[PDB]
C-alpha cells in the first residue's frame, strides 16, 4: 500500500472546550476566574549559575544568585466558599472513519473502507469504544485537577439517549477498573452507543459530559495554558466574564489516551503517528520499529487478508490493528508529497 | 528630487544577482549618469540569458552577444512589446488627456517602469533593451535612447563591441517601434469590457488595463507603510493602498431610497493598485443597471444622481478558487487561488430620480441588479417596506433604516502622486481611495468586438479619495450626491458638487 | 452544435453568506465569534519521518519526532450559554437561464434558447427546482454544523409569498427524504414558485431561510475556510464584530450538490462542467466520457429533436437533460478560445 499524495480522515470524536464553573453552597454556579498574580523566584536554573560542560560562571557569585526574579503567571484557584467545581463539555462520536475525507485514488480508498468494516466484524467495536469511554466515564480530561482531590463525579447525558443519566460517583475509589465500569448497570447500553455511532455510515452519539469536582480549600486549578507572563491560561468568555479553560484539543487528547498497545508497553499514550511520550520526549512507535502507523499502513492489504480468514486473529496483529483504527478515529493527513 | 543610487553605490557589496534586481521594474531606478556606462551595459547585456549561466560584469561573455545579429534581432523584436499597460496584445500609451487635481491616474505619474509583456521565451532577451535607468536625469530605456544613433549610449556600446554597422542599422530599426501603441484585437473576449454610458444617449464600452507605472508607483511608494499596504501573491508580490483601518460607523445626520442593499462578495480590489470599497463607476453600474432595469415598464427612469451611504464595509482576503475546467489533452486540475479581495458592503441608495410617481414594491425589488461589483446585491425583504419614493432629501437620509453610516463624495485636495495621498490619508483615518472613474487612452472608435456593439475605449483607473460627510443640515446635497459625468478625455464618477 | 467564441450565462441561483448568530436563551442574537487559538500539536505528518519512497528519514529521530509544532488555528465554538446557533441567508431563483448573457452567433443562441423552452414544457422544471429546493430546505449549506448536533430547524420566508413562514422542523428525523419533503403544507406553493421564477421571463423567487441549529454545549461550529496560520476562518463583520461564514459561493455550491446523473452514481455531486468531487480527489464525467458538459451540450440540436418528439425521451438522455439544463442555471462562460 503506496501513500496517495492526497489521504485525509476527519475526526470521529470531537470533543468541546472543558468550561468552569464554581458551585457555591447556595447551588449557584460562577464560571471560575484566574489573574495574574506576581512571584517572586529565586535563580533557579541551572543556566543561570552554571556554564555549559558544568562549569560554575564566575559572574554568577553568591549575590547575584541571591537576587529573586519577577516571574508573571496566571493564577486559578477555587474561591474559599465553594462547594465545589464543576466542569462541562461535551463529546461527539460520530462514523467519519468509514470512507476518508480525502483520498485520490480509490485503490486505497477502497483497501481502507473495508478494512474498516473487516475490523468492526471480526474485531468488534467494543475494544476501542471501552478505552475511549473508559477516560470520558473516569475523569481524564481533568488532567491534574483530580490528582488533588476529594472526588469527582462524572455525570454524563448521552443525546440519543432514552432513559436516565449515567452517574460515576467517586471515581478515586469505586471506578478505578475497566471491570468497575462495566459494572454499572449503564455502561453497556453506553458502549452499544458508541459503537452504533462508530458502524452505522451517518449516525453519532454526542455525549454531554459534567464533572463535579470537590478540591480542598483554596485548591488551585490547573486549567489549560495557552502557546507563545509565565504561565498564561487558555481561556473563554462564561456571563461576559472570562474562565480558564481547558482546551478542545487537550481534551481530546485526554480522551485519546488509549494507545497502550506498543512496544515495551507501560501505560496509556496519545494515540498518534509515531506514539510520542511527553513524559520522556522520545516517541515510541519509531519508524524505526514497524510499530509506526504509516508502517502498519503501508501492510494494510495484510492485514485485510489476515483478518478475513476465519481463524482467530493473534494479539499482535489486533494489537496492530486496533492502533491502526484508533490512529483512523484520530483523523489526519496520511499522505506524502 | 532624485537620490540617485548609482551602481558606484552598488557594485562592490553583494553583485550576485542583486543587480537584476536593480534593474527590474518594481525596484528604484540606477543611476549610469556618467559614471559606468561601459562596465553599466555589460550587464544589461549579459542579462539576456537569465538562467544559471549567469554572472556579470564579464566584457568577453558580452561581446560575444553584441556581435550577433541573431541575438541582436531576437532582443530589438522584444522592445516592440514594452506595454506601458498591462490588460491583467501591445498597448504603450500616454493616457491622453488631463485628470484634475483631485484625481489620480497615469497621467500624473511620470511615464517609466514600461515592462516588457509578452511570451516567457525572451522575457530573459527582454533585459537588454526594455530595461529603464535614469541618467542626465532623464530616466529612460535603450529602446528610446538608441534611436537617434548618436547617444554616447551608442558610442559605448561600440566601445564595449559591434561591427560598427550595427550602430545605424540597429538604430533605424528602433526608429521603427511606434513609440506610442495600442494594437489589442479583442474579440477572444481576454479585456474584461464594460460599457459605461456616455452624453446620456449612448454608451462607450471601456476595456480597463492596469497602469504599469501605476502599479510600479504604488508599489514603492508603499513599502514603509504597512498600515495601507495589502500584499496580493498574484500567483509577483505587488502592493495596493487600503483604508486607514477598520470602517467605523458614526451617525449620517423625487428620491427613491434602497434602504439596506448589502453586498457578500464584491471584489475589494477597486484599482490594480487599490483595495478598498468597490469602484464608485461599480456603484454607478449598480445604479444604472437598476434604471435600465426599470426602463422595460417605465421608460422615462432616468436616475441623474445618487448618494450612496456605506453602513458597513469590510475588505479580507479571501480565496476565489479557481475553475475546475482544464480542456487540455490530458487530465484535468484547478490552478492556484489568485488571492482575491473581498469586501462585504452593507449600503445605501438614495437615487435622485426624475420620476414622482408610484413605482411599487412588485417593479422595485425585481428589476434590482443583483450584483454590485461580482457580489451578490440583496435587499432583505423586510427592507422592501422601506423602498420608498421621497420628495425631499431630508426626509430620505431621516428614512434609511440603520442610522451608522458614511456619505462617500470625493477629496477635492490634491492628489498628484501617491505622497499626496497617502500624506491625506494618514491625517484622515477611514478616508479611502477607490476607482472613480476611467482615463481613456484611445479616442473611442468601433472595434471589431465590443460589449453589446458600443464603441470601444481602453480605459485606465482613476483613483480618488473618497470621503465621509455626516449629513448635517448645512450640508450640500451636490456633494453626496454623485454623478457619471463623461469628459472628452477621462470619463469620471463624481459628485454633483464637484 | 458547434460551441461559439464566447458563451456566457448569468448565472440563475443567486445565494449570499451564511452568517453565524448566537440565540441566547433570554432571546437575544449576538453574531458568533472566533478567535486564533496556538496548538501545540505533534509531529504527525508522513513528510517529517519519511524520505520519497518509504525510507524513514535518519535525522528524525525519536528525539526529534517528540517536539510538538505550533499550529495557530482560529476555534469559533458556540458559547457556553447558547440557546442555540441561527444561521441565516438568502437565496434568489431568478430566470437568467433563458437566454445568455453573451453569444457571438446567433445559431447556437437560438438553439438553447428554443433548448430551455422545449426542455420547460416537456420535462417541468419540477425535477431541477425540487433539488435545488431540498438542499435549501434540509440543512445542506450547513456544510459540517449540522453533523454533530441535536436538531436543526428551517424557517423559511419567499418573498413572493401571501402566506405565512414555511417551516421544516427536525430535518434529521421528519424530513430525511424527497417524498418528506413533498408532504409538507407547503412545499408545492414553494416548488411551483420556484418553476415559475425559472418560467417568467424577467421574475424571482427570494428566500431567506434561517435555520435554528442546537449544537451540543461548546460545539465546534465550522465555517468556510482560506486556503492558506493553519486554519484561517472566512469572515465578516456583523453588528461592527467580527463573525465567521460560509461564504457565497460555499453555500451556492451547496445548494447546487444535485448532479447524481453521472455514470455510476454514488451521491450527489456540484454541478459543473465535469462532475468534480473534492472528496475524492478525481473527477467524474471527464471528457473521456460522454458525459462532460461539453460533450452533452454539442449534442443540444439531437436533444432539440428528441423532445420535439411526442413520445417521452428515454431516462439516459433525460437525465442528461437536466444535468445541461442544471449546469446552464449554475451560469458560466461555456466557450473555447
Avoid at chain 1, 454531554?208 to 468568555?237: D, G, I, K, Y
Avoid at chain 2, 481602453?458 to 448635517?472: M, P, R, V
Wanted: one cysteine or more.
Amino acid at each position: 500500500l503506496k501513500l496517495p499524495t492526497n489521504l485525509a480522515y476527519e475526526r470521529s470524536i470531537d470533543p468541546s472546550d472543558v468550561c468552569f464553573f464554581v458551585v457555591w453552597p447556595d447551588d449557584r454556579k460562577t464560571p471560575l476566574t484566574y489573574n495574574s498574580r506576581t512571584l517572586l523566584g529565586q535563580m533557579e536554573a541551572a543556566s543561570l549559575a552554571y556554564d555549559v560542560s558544568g562549569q560554575p560562571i564566575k559572574s554568577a557569585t553568591a549575590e547575584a544568585l541571591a537576587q529573586g526574579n519577577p516571574h508573571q503567571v496566571d493564577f486559578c484557584h477555587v474561591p474559599y466558599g465553594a462547594s465545589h467545581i464543576e466542569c462541562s463539555f461535551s463529546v461527539s462520536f460520530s462514523s467519519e472513519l468509514r470512507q476518508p475525507y480525502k483520498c485520490n485514488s480509490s485503490k486505497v480508498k477502497q483497501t481502507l473502507v473495508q478494512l474498516v468494516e473487516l475490523y468492526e466484524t471480526k474485531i468488534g467495536w467494543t475494544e476501542l469504544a471501552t478505552r475511549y469511554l473508559m477516560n470520558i466515564c473516569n475523569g481524564k480530561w481533568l488532567w491534574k485537577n483530580t490528582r488533588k482531590a476529594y472526588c469527582w463525579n462524572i455525570v454524563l447525558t448521552p443525546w440519543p439517549w432514552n432513559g436516565e443519566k449515567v452517574g460515576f460517583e467517586d471515581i478515586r475509589t469505586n471506578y478505578t477498573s475497566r471491570q468497575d465500569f462495566k459494572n454499572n448497570k449503564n455502561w453497556s447500553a453506553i458502549v452499544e452507543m458508541i459503537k452504533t455511532a462508530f458502524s452505522s455510515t451517518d449516525g453519532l452519539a454526542i455525549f454531554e459530559v459534567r464533572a463535579t469536582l470537590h478540591l480542598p480549600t483554596n485548591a488551585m486549578v490547573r486549567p489549560s495554558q495557552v502557546f507563545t507572563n509565565s504561565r498564561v491560561f487558555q481561556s473563554t468568555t462564561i456571563d461576559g466574564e472570562r474562565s480558564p479553560i481547558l482546551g478542545a484539543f487537550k481534551t481530546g487528547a485526554a480522551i485519546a489516551t488509549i494507545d497502550d498497545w506498543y512496544p515495551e508497553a507501560t501505560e496509556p499514550l496519545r494515540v498518534g503517528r509515531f506514539g510520542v511520550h511527553r513524559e520522556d520526549v522520545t516517541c515510541y512507535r519509531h519508524p524505526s520499529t514497524g510499530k509506526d502507523f504509516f508502517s502498519i499502513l503501508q501492510q494494510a492489504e495484510h492485514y485485510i487478508e489476515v483478518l478475513s480468514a476465519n481463524k482467530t486473529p493473534a494479539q499482535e496483529t489486533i494489537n496492530d490493528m486496533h492502533f491502526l483504527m484508533a490512529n483512523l478515529i484520530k483523523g489526519g493527513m496520511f499522505q506524502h508529497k | 528630487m532624485q537620490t540617485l543610487k548609482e551602481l558606484i553605490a552598488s557594485n562592490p557589496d553583494d553583485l550576485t544577482t542583486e543587480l537584476k534586481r536593480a534593474f527590474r521594474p518594481l525596484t528604484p531606478h540606477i543611476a549610469i549618469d556618467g559614471n559606468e556606462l561601459d562596465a553599466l551595459t555589460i550587464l544589461v547585456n549579459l542579462t539576456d540569458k537569465t538562467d544559471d549561466q549567469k554572472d556579470l560584469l564579464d566584457r568577453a561573455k558580452c561581446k560575444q552577444k553584441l556581435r550577433d545579429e541573431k541575438w541582436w534581432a531576437s532582443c530589438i523584436n522584444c522592445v516592440n512589446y514594452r506595454q506601458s499597460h498591462n490588460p491583467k496584445g501591445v498597448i504603450r500609451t500616454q493616457a491622453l488627456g488631463e485628470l484634475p487635481s483631485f484625481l489620480l491616474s497615469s497621467s500624473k505619474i511620470p511615464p517609466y517602469h514600461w515592462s516588457y509583456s509578452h511570451d516567457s521565451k525572451y522575457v530573459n532577451k527582454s533585459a537588454f533593451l526594455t530595461n529603464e535607468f535614469c541618467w542626465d536625469g532623464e530616466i529612460s530605456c535603450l529602446g528610446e535612447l538608441l534611436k537617434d544613433a548618436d547617444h554616447p549610449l551608442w558610442n559605448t556600446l561600440k566601445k564595449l563591441g559591434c561591427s560598427q554597422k550595427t550602430c545605424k542599422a540597429m538604430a533605424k530599426q528602433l526608429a521603427d517601434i511606434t513609440l506610442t501603441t495600442i494594437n489589442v484585437t479583442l474579440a477572444p473576449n481576454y479585456l474584461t469590457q464594460i460599457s459605461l454610458p456616455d452624453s446620456d444617449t449612448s454608451y462607450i464600452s471601456l476595456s480597463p488595463v492596469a497602469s504599469l507605472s501605476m502599479q510600479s508607483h504604488f508599489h514603492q511608494r508603499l513599502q514603509d507603510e504597512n498600515r495601507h499596504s495589502a500584499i496580493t501573491r498574484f500567483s509577483g508580490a505587488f502592493r495596493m493602498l487600503k483604508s486607514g483601518a477598520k470602517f467605523s460607523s458614526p451617525p449620517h445626520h423625487s428620491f427613491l431610497v434602497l434602504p439596506n442593499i448589502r453586498v457578500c462578495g464584491a471584489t475589494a480590489l477597486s484599482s490594480p493598485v487599490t483595495v478598498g470599497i468597490p469602484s464608485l463607476t461599480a456603484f454607478f453600474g449598480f445604479v444604472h443597471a437598476f434604471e435600465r432595469n426599470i426602463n422595460r415598464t417605465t421608460s422615462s427612469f432616468r436616475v441623474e444622481s445618487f448618494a450612496i451611504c456605506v453602513h458597513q464595509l469590510h475588505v479580507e482576503k479571501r480565496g476565489l478558487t479557481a475553475e475546475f475546467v482544464e480542456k487540455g489533452d490530458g487530465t484535468i486540475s484547478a490552478p492556484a487561488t489568485r488571492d482575491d479581495w473581498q469586501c462585504d458592503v452593507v449600503f445605501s441608495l438614495i437615487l435622485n430620480t426624475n420620476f414622482a410617481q408610484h413605482i411599487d414594491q412588485d417593479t422595485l425589488v425585481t428589476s434590482l441588479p443583483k450584483r454590485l461589483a461580482r457580489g451578490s446585491a440583496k435587499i432583505a425583504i423586510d427592507d422592501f417596506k422601506h423602498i420608498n419614493s421621497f420628495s425631499t432629501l431630508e426626509t430620505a437620509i431621516e428614512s434609511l433604516p440603520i442610522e451608522a453610516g458614511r456619505w462617500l463624495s470625493l477629496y477635492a485636495q490634491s492628489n498628484n502622486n501617491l505622497s499626496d495621498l497617502l500624506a491625506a490619508m494618514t491625517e484622515d483615518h477611514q478616508l479611502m481611495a477607490s476607482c472613480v472613474g476611467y482615463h481613456l487612452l484611445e479616442e473611442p472608435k468601433d472595434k471589431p468586438n465590443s460589449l453589446r456593439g458600443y464603441k470601444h475605449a481602453i480605459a485606465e483607473c482613476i483613483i480618488g479619495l473618497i470621503n465621509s460627510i455626516t449629513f448635517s443640515s448645512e450640508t450640500d446635497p451636490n456633494t453626496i450626491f454623485w454623478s457619471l459625468k463623461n469628459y472628452q478625455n477621462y470619463l469620471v464618477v463624481q459628485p454633483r458638487s464637484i
